CSV table of C-alpha atoms in Angstrom, one decimal:
chain,number,residue,atom,x,y,z
A,3,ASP,CA,41.1,24.2,56.3
A,4,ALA,CA,44.5,23.6,57.4
A,5,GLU,CA,46.4,26.6,58.4
A,6,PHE,CA,49.5,25.2,57.7
A,7,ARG,CA,51.5,28.3,58.2
A,8,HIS,CA,54.9,28.0,59.4
A,9,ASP,CA,56.8,30.4,61.4
A,10,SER,CA,60.6,30.8,62.3
A,11,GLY,CA,61.8,33.8,62.5
A,12,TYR,CA,65.3,31.9,60.6
A,13,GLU,CA,65.4,29.0,59.4
A,14,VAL,CA,68.5,27.1,57.7
A,15,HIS,CA,68.9,24.5,55.5
A,16,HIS,CA,71.8,22.7,54.2
A,17,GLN,CA,75.0,25.4,54.9
A,18,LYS,CA,78.2,24.6,55.3
A,19,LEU,CA,80.8,27.2,57.2
A,20,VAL,CA,83.8,26.0,57.1
A,21,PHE,CA,86.7,29.1,58.3
A,22,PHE,CA,89.7,28.0,57.8
A,23,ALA,CA,93.2,29.7,59.4
A,24,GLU,CA,96.4,28.9,58.5
A,25,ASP,CA,100.2,30.3,60.3
A,26,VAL,CA,98.6,33.4,61.5
A,27,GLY,CA,101.6,34.6,63.5
A,28,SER,CA,104.3,31.9,62.9
A,29,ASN,CA,107.3,31.6,63.2
A,30,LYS,CA,108.3,28.9,60.2
A,31,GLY,CA,111.5,31.0,58.8
A,32,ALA,CA,114.9,32.1,61.0
A,33,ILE,CA,114.3,35.5,63.3
A,34,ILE,CA,118.0,36.0,65.3
A,35,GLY,CA,118.4,38.9,67.5
A,36,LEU,CA,121.6,39.2,66.3
A,37,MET,CA,124.4,38.2,65.2
A,38,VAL,CA,127.4,39.4,65.9
A,39,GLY,CA,130.8,37.7,64.5
A,40,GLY,CA,134.7,38.2,63.8
A,41,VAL,CA,135.2,41.7,66.1
A,42,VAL,CA,139.1,42.1,67.5
B,1,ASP,CA,40.6,27.3,52.5
B,2,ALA,CA,44.3,26.7,53.9
B,3,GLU,CA,46.4,30.1,54.4
B,4,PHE,CA,49.4,27.3,53.5
B,5,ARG,CA,51.4,30.8,54.7
B,6,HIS,CA,55.8,30.3,54.5
B,7,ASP,CA,56.3,33.2,57.2
B,8,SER,CA,60.5,33.5,57.6
B,9,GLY,CA,62.3,36.5,59.6
B,10,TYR,CA,65.7,34.8,57.7
B,11,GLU,CA,65.6,31.6,55.6
B,12,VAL,CA,69.1,30.2,53.5
B,13,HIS,CA,68.8,27.7,51.8
B,14,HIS,CA,71.4,26.0,49.8
B,15,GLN,CA,74.8,28.8,51.1
B,16,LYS,CA,77.9,28.0,52.0
B,17,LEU,CA,80.9,30.1,52.9
B,18,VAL,CA,83.9,29.7,53.2
B,19,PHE,CA,87.0,31.9,54.4
B,20,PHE,CA,91.4,31.2,54.3
B,21,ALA,CA,93.1,32.6,56.1
B,22,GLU,CA,96.5,31.9,55.3
B,23,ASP,CA,99.2,33.1,57.1
B,24,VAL,CA,98.3,37.0,58.6
B,25,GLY,CA,102.2,38.0,60.3
B,26,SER,CA,103.7,34.8,59.7
B,27,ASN,CA,107.7,35.1,58.9
B,28,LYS,CA,108.6,32.4,56.6
B,29,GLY,CA,111.2,34.4,55.4
B,30,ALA,CA,114.6,35.2,57.5
B,31,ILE,CA,114.2,38.5,60.5
B,32,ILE,CA,117.5,39.8,61.4
B,33,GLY,CA,118.1,42.5,64.1
B,34,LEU,CA,121.8,43.2,63.2
B,35,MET,CA,124.1,41.5,60.9
B,36,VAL,CA,127.8,42.3,62.6
B,37,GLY,CA,131.2,41.0,61.0
B,38,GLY,CA,134.3,42.5,60.6
B,39,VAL,CA,135.1,44.6,63.4
B,40,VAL,CA,138.4,45.9,64.8
C,15,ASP,CA,41.2,29.4,48.3
C,16,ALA,CA,44.2,29.4,49.5
C,17,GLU,CA,45.7,32.1,50.3
C,18,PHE,CA,49.2,30.5,49.7
C,19,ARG,CA,51.4,33.4,51.0
C,20,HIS,CA,55.3,33.6,51.1
C,21,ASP,CA,56.4,35.8,54.0
C,22,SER,CA,60.6,36.0,54.1
C,23,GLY,CA,62.1,39.3,55.5
C,24,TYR,CA,65.4,37.8,53.9
C,25,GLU,CA,65.0,35.0,51.7
C,26,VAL,CA,68.8,33.4,49.6
C,27,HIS,CA,68.4,30.1,47.9
C,28,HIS,CA,71.7,28.8,46.6
C,29,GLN,CA,74.1,31.6,47.1
C,30,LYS,CA,78.1,30.4,48.5
C,31,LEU,CA,80.9,33.0,49.3
C,32,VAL,CA,84.4,32.4,49.2
C,33,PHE,CA,86.3,35.3,51.5
C,34,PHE,CA,89.7,34.0,50.8
C,35,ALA,CA,92.9,36.2,52.5
C,36,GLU,CA,96.2,35.0,51.9
C,37,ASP,CA,99.8,36.0,52.8
C,38,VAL,CA,98.3,39.6,54.5
C,39,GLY,CA,101.1,41.3,56.5
C,40,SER,CA,103.4,38.8,56.2
C,41,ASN,CA,107.7,38.5,55.8
C,42,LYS,CA,108.1,35.4,53.3
C,43,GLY,CA,111.1,37.3,52.5
C,44,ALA,CA,113.8,38.8,55.2
C,45,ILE,CA,113.8,42.4,56.6
C,46,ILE,CA,117.3,43.4,57.9
C,47,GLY,CA,117.4,46.1,61.6
C,48,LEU,CA,121.3,46.9,60.8
C,49,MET,CA,123.7,44.9,58.7
C,50,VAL,CA,127.3,46.0,59.3
C,51,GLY,CA,130.8,44.6,58.0
C,52,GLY,CA,134.4,45.2,57.3
C,53,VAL,CA,134.2,48.2,60.1
C,54,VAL,CA,138.4,49.1,61.4
D,18,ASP,CA,41.3,32.2,43.6
D,19,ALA,CA,44.8,32.0,45.6
D,20,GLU,CA,46.3,35.3,46.1
D,21,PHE,CA,49.9,33.4,45.7
D,22,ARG,CA,51.3,36.2,46.9
D,23,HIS,CA,56.1,35.7,47.6
D,24,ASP,CA,56.9,38.3,49.8
D,25,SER,CA,60.1,38.9,50.5
D,26,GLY,CA,61.9,42.8,51.0
D,27,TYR,CA,65.7,41.3,50.5
D,28,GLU,CA,66.0,37.3,48.4
D,29,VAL,CA,68.9,36.4,47.2
D,30,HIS,CA,68.2,33.2,44.2
D,31,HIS,CA,71.9,32.0,43.0
D,32,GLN,CA,74.1,34.2,43.9
D,33,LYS,CA,77.8,33.6,44.9
D,34,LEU,CA,80.6,36.6,45.9
D,35,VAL,CA,84.2,35.3,45.8
D,36,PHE,CA,86.1,38.4,47.5
D,37,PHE,CA,90.1,37.8,46.9
D,38,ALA,CA,92.9,39.4,49.2
D,39,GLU,CA,96.4,38.4,48.6
D,40,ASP,CA,100.1,39.8,49.9
D,41,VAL,CA,98.6,42.8,51.7
D,42,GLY,CA,101.6,44.4,53.7
D,43,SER,CA,103.7,41.7,53.1
D,44,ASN,CA,107.0,42.2,52.6
D,45,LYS,CA,108.3,38.8,49.8
D,46,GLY,CA,111.7,41.1,49.3
D,47,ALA,CA,114.5,41.9,50.7
D,48,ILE,CA,113.8,44.8,53.7
D,49,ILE,CA,117.2,45.9,55.0
D,50,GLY,CA,117.5,49.2,57.5
D,51,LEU,CA,121.3,50.0,57.5
D,52,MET,CA,124.2,48.4,55.1
D,53,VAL,CA,127.3,49.3,56.1
D,54,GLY,CA,130.4,48.4,54.5
D,55,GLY,CA,133.6,49.1,53.8
D,56,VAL,CA,134.3,51.2,57.0
D,57,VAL,CA,138.3,52.4,58.3
E,5,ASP,CA,40.9,34.9,40.2
E,6,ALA,CA,44.4,34.6,42.0
E,7,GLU,CA,46.2,38.5,43.1
E,8,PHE,CA,50.1,36.1,41.9
E,9,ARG,CA,51.4,39.3,43.1
E,10,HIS,CA,55.3,38.8,44.4
E,11,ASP,CA,56.4,42.0,45.6
E,12,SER,CA,60.2,42.1,46.9
E,13,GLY,CA,61.8,44.6,48.2
E,14,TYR,CA,65.3,43.4,46.6
E,15,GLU,CA,65.7,40.4,43.3
E,16,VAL,CA,68.8,39.3,42.8
E,17,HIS,CA,69.3,36.5,40.7
E,18,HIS,CA,72.3,34.8,39.2
E,19,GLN,CA,74.3,37.4,40.9
E,20,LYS,CA,78.4,36.8,41.0
E,21,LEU,CA,80.6,39.2,42.1
E,22,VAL,CA,84.8,38.8,42.2
E,23,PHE,CA,87.0,41.3,44.5
E,24,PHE,CA,90.7,40.3,43.0
E,25,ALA,CA,93.5,42.9,45.9
E,26,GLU,CA,97.1,41.3,44.5
E,27,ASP,CA,100.2,43.1,46.1
E,28,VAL,CA,98.5,45.5,47.7
E,29,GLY,CA,101.3,48.0,50.0
E,30,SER,CA,104.5,45.6,50.1
E,31,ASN,CA,107.5,44.6,49.6
E,32,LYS,CA,109.1,42.9,47.0
E,33,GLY,CA,111.5,43.7,45.4
E,34,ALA,CA,114.1,45.3,48.4
E,35,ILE,CA,113.7,48.5,50.6
E,36,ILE,CA,116.9,49.3,52.2
E,37,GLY,CA,118.1,52.7,53.9
E,38,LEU,CA,121.4,53.7,53.8
E,39,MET,CA,124.0,51.6,52.2
E,40,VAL,CA,128.0,53.5,53.1
E,41,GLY,CA,130.6,51.6,52.1
E,42,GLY,CA,134.2,52.3,51.5
E,43,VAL,CA,134.7,55.4,53.4
E,44,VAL,CA,137.9,56.1,55.0
F,29,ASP,CA,169.3,61.8,64.4
F,30,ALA,CA,166.6,59.6,65.1
F,31,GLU,CA,163.9,59.3,62.3
F,32,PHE,CA,161.0,59.8,63.4
F,33,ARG,CA,158.9,58.4,61.6
F,34,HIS,CA,154.5,58.0,61.3
F,35,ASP,CA,153.9,55.2,59.2
F,36,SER,CA,150.4,53.8,58.9
F,37,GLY,CA,148.7,53.5,55.7
F,38,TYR,CA,145.2,54.8,56.9
F,39,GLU,CA,145.1,57.2,59.6
F,40,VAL,CA,141.9,58.3,60.9
F,41,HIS,CA,141.4,59.7,64.2
F,42,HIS,CA,138.5,61.8,66.3
F,43,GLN,CA,135.8,60.4,63.9
F,44,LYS,CA,131.7,60.2,64.3
F,45,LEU,CA,130.0,58.1,62.6
F,46,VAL,CA,126.1,59.3,63.2
F,47,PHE,CA,123.7,56.3,60.7
F,48,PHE,CA,120.9,56.7,61.6
F,49,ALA,CA,117.0,54.8,59.2
F,50,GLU,CA,114.2,55.5,60.6
F,51,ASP,CA,110.8,53.6,59.3
F,52,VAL,CA,112.4,51.6,56.1
F,53,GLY,CA,109.5,49.5,55.6
F,54,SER,CA,107.2,50.7,57.6
F,55,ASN,CA,103.2,50.3,57.6
F,56,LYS,CA,101.8,53.4,60.2
F,57,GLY,CA,99.0,54.0,58.4
F,58,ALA,CA,96.4,51.3,57.9
F,59,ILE,CA,96.4,49.4,54.8
F,60,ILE,CA,92.7,47.8,53.2
F,61,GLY,CA,92.8,45.0,50.7
F,62,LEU,CA,89.2,45.8,50.2
F,63,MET,CA,86.2,46.9,51.9
F,64,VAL,CA,82.4,45.7,50.8
F,65,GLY,CA,80.5,46.9,52.5
F,66,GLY,CA,76.0,46.8,51.7
F,67,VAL,CA,75.6,44.5,49.3
F,68,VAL,CA,72.4,43.2,48.4
G,11,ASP,CA,169.8,58.3,66.4
G,12,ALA,CA,166.8,56.2,68.3
G,13,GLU,CA,163.9,55.3,65.1
G,14,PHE,CA,161.1,56.1,66.8
G,15,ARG,CA,158.9,54.6,64.8
G,16,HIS,CA,155.5,54.3,64.4
G,17,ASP,CA,154.1,52.2,61.7
G,18,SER,CA,150.4,51.1,61.5
G,19,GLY,CA,148.5,49.4,58.1
G,20,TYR,CA,145.7,50.8,60.1
G,21,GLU,CA,145.8,53.3,62.7
G,22,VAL,CA,142.3,53.7,64.6
G,23,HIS,CA,142.0,57.0,67.6
G,24,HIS,CA,138.9,58.5,69.3
G,25,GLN,CA,136.1,57.0,67.3
G,26,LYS,CA,132.2,56.1,67.6
G,27,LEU,CA,129.9,54.8,65.2
G,28,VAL,CA,126.4,54.9,66.5
G,29,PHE,CA,124.2,52.5,64.3
G,30,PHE,CA,120.3,53.1,64.9
G,31,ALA,CA,117.6,51.9,62.7
G,32,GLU,CA,113.8,52.3,64.1
G,33,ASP,CA,110.9,50.0,62.6
G,34,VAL,CA,112.0,48.6,60.3
G,35,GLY,CA,109.4,45.6,58.2
G,36,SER,CA,107.0,46.9,60.9
G,37,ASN,CA,103.5,47.8,61.1
G,38,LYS,CA,102.5,49.5,63.7
G,39,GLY,CA,98.6,50.0,61.3
G,40,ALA,CA,96.6,48.0,61.1
G,41,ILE,CA,96.3,46.0,58.1
G,42,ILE,CA,93.5,44.5,56.6
G,43,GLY,CA,93.0,42.0,54.0
G,44,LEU,CA,88.9,42.6,52.9
G,45,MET,CA,86.0,43.8,54.8
G,46,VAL,CA,83.2,43.0,54.1
G,47,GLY,CA,79.9,44.3,55.9
G,48,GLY,CA,76.4,44.2,55.1
G,49,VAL,CA,76.0,41.9,52.8
G,50,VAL,CA,72.8,39.9,51.8
H,12,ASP,CA,169.9,53.8,70.0
H,13,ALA,CA,166.7,52.4,71.0
H,14,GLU,CA,164.7,51.7,67.5
H,15,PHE,CA,161.7,52.7,69.3
H,16,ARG,CA,159.7,50.5,67.4
H,17,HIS,CA,154.7,50.0,66.9
H,18,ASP,CA,154.3,48.1,64.5
H,19,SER,CA,150.7,47.4,64.6
H,20,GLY,CA,148.8,45.4,61.8
H,21,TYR,CA,145.6,47.4,63.2
H,22,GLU,CA,145.6,49.7,66.5
H,23,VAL,CA,142.6,50.8,67.7
H,24,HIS,CA,142.6,53.0,71.0
H,25,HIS,CA,139.3,55.0,72.3
H,26,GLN,CA,136.3,53.8,70.2
H,27,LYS,CA,132.9,52.5,71.2
H,28,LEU,CA,130.0,51.9,68.8
H,29,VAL,CA,126.8,51.5,68.7
H,30,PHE,CA,124.3,49.5,67.2
H,31,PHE,CA,120.5,49.9,68.2
H,32,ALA,CA,117.8,48.1,66.4
H,33,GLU,CA,114.3,49.0,67.4
H,34,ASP,CA,111.1,47.1,65.6
H,35,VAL,CA,112.8,44.7,62.9
H,36,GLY,CA,109.1,42.6,61.5
H,37,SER,CA,107.4,43.8,65.1
H,38,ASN,CA,103.6,44.1,64.7
H,39,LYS,CA,102.6,46.1,67.1
H,40,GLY,CA,99.7,47.6,65.6
H,41,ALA,CA,96.7,45.2,64.9
H,42,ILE,CA,96.8,42.5,61.6
H,43,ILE,CA,93.3,40.6,60.4
H,44,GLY,CA,93.1,38.6,57.9
H,45,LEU,CA,90.0,39.0,57.5
H,46,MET,CA,86.6,40.6,59.2
H,47,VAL,CA,83.3,39.7,57.4
H,48,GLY,CA,80.0,40.5,59.1
H,49,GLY,CA,75.6,40.9,58.6
H,50,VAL,CA,75.4,38.9,56.2
H,51,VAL,CA,73.1,37.4,55.2
I,6,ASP,CA,170.5,50.0,72.7
I,7,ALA,CA,167.0,48.3,74.1
I,8,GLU,CA,164.7,48.2,70.3
I,9,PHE,CA,162.0,48.3,72.7
I,10,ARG,CA,159.1,47.0,70.5
I,11,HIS,CA,155.9,46.7,70.3
I,12,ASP,CA,154.8,44.4,67.6
I,13,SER,CA,151.1,44.0,68.0
I,14,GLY,CA,148.5,42.3,64.6
I,15,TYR,CA,145.3,43.6,66.3
I,16,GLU,CA,145.8,46.7,68.8
I,17,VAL,CA,142.7,47.8,70.7
I,18,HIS,CA,142.5,49.9,73.4
I,19,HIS,CA,139.8,50.7,75.5
I,20,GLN,CA,136.8,50.6,73.3
I,21,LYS,CA,133.2,50.1,74.1
I,22,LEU,CA,130.5,48.0,71.8
I,23,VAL,CA,127.6,47.3,72.3
I,24,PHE,CA,124.8,46.0,70.6
I,25,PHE,CA,120.6,46.1,71.2
I,26,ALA,CA,117.9,45.0,69.3
I,27,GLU,CA,114.3,45.1,70.8
I,28,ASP,CA,111.4,43.7,68.9
I,29,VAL,CA,112.3,41.8,66.5
I,30,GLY,CA,109.7,39.5,64.9
I,31,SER,CA,106.8,40.4,67.8
I,32,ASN,CA,103.5,40.8,67.8
I,33,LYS,CA,102.3,43.3,71.2
I,34,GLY,CA,99.8,44.3,68.8
I,35,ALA,CA,97.3,42.3,67.9
I,36,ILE,CA,96.9,39.7,65.4
I,37,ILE,CA,93.2,38.1,64.0
I,38,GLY,CA,93.0,34.8,61.4
I,39,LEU,CA,89.9,36.3,60.5
I,40,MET,CA,86.4,37.9,62.9
I,41,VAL,CA,83.5,35.9,62.0
I,42,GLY,CA,80.4,37.5,63.1
I,43,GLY,CA,75.8,37.5,62.7
I,44,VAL,CA,76.2,35.6,59.8
I,45,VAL,CA,72.1,34.1,58.9
J,20,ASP,CA,170.7,46.2,75.4
J,21,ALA,CA,167.2,44.9,76.8
J,22,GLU,CA,165.0,44.2,73.7
J,23,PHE,CA,162.1,44.9,75.2
J,24,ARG,CA,160.0,43.4,72.8
J,25,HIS,CA,155.9,43.4,73.2
J,26,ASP,CA,155.1,40.2,70.2
J,27,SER,CA,151.2,40.0,70.6
J,28,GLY,CA,148.6,38.5,68.1
J,29,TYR,CA,145.3,40.0,69.0
J,30,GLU,CA,146.3,42.6,72.3
J,31,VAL,CA,143.2,44.1,73.9
J,32,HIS,CA,143.1,46.5,76.6
J,33,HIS,CA,140.1,47.7,78.9
J,34,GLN,CA,137.3,46.2,76.0
J,35,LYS,CA,133.6,46.3,77.1
J,36,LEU,CA,131.2,44.2,74.5
J,37,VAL,CA,127.3,44.5,75.9
J,38,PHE,CA,124.4,42.4,74.0
J,39,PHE,CA,121.2,43.0,74.0
J,40,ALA,CA,118.0,41.4,72.4
J,41,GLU,CA,114.9,42.1,74.2
J,42,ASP,CA,111.2,40.3,72.9
J,43,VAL,CA,112.6,38.4,69.8
J,44,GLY,CA,110.2,36.0,68.3
J,45,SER,CA,107.2,37.1,70.9
J,46,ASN,CA,103.5,38.1,71.6
J,47,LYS,CA,103.4,40.2,75.2
J,48,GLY,CA,99.5,41.3,72.2
J,49,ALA,CA,96.9,38.7,71.7
J,50,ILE,CA,96.6,36.3,68.4
J,51,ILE,CA,93.4,34.9,67.0
J,52,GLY,CA,93.3,32.1,64.7
J,53,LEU,CA,89.8,32.9,63.7
J,54,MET,CA,86.8,34.4,66.2
J,55,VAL,CA,83.6,33.6,64.6
J,56,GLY,CA,80.3,35.4,66.9
J,57,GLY,CA,76.3,35.3,66.0
J,58,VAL,CA,75.7,33.4,63.0
J,59,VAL,CA,72.5,31.0,63.3
């Protein structure tokens, strides 16, 4: 007469989570404040 | 007469989550504040 | 006379979620504040 | 005389969700504040 | 005399949801504030 | 018998030019790619 | 018999130019790629 | 009989140029790639 | 009979140029790649 | 009969140039790659 209970508040089996973040907030391109040329 | 209960508030089986973020807030292109040329 | 109960408030089986975000808020193209040329 | 109950408030089987966001709020094209040329 | 009950408030089987957003709020084309040329 | 010539190809006297660009291509308001809620 | 010539190809006197660019290509407001909530 | 010539190809007198660029390409507001909450 | 010539290819007198660039390409606001919370 | 010539290819008198760049490419605000919380 075994109860054979399984009682888990959270059960996770076989779960894969991948989180990928690439290039958040990054300057691969040039940023120039000012360019001044040829000023007389 | 086994009860054979399974009682889990959350059960997850075989779940894959992929979160990908690419290039959030990023400057691959050029940003220029000002360009001034040829000023006499 | 086994009860054979399954009692899970949330059951998930075989669920795949993919979230992809690409290029949120990103400057691949050029942004220029001002361009001034040829001013006499 | 088994009850054989299945009692899950939410049951999900075999669900795939894909969320894709591309180019939200992004400047692939040029933005120029002003261009002034040839001013005498 | 098994009851054989299935009692799930929400049951989902085999559901695929795809949400795609492309180019929300994005400037692939040029935006220019002003262009002034040839002013004497 | 002074000639008293003034010969200037371009003459500018007392000229003020103001160019103002405000908020070109800018997101003061929120942009959201997708909002998904309450999905079972 | 003085010639008293003035001969300048470009003459500028008293010229003020102000160029102002504000908030070109800028995110003061929030941009969100996706928001997902409450997904079972 | 003095010639008294003035011969300058470009003459500039009393010229003030102000160029101001503010907040080009800048994120004062929040940018989020994805927000996921409450996923079971 | 003095010639009294002035012959300067470029003459500049009394010229003030101010170039100001503020906050080009800058993140005063938060940028987050992903936020995931409450995932079971 | 003095010639009294002044012959300067570029003449600059009394010129002040101020160039100011502030906060080009700078993170005063927080940037986070990912935040994950509460994952079971």
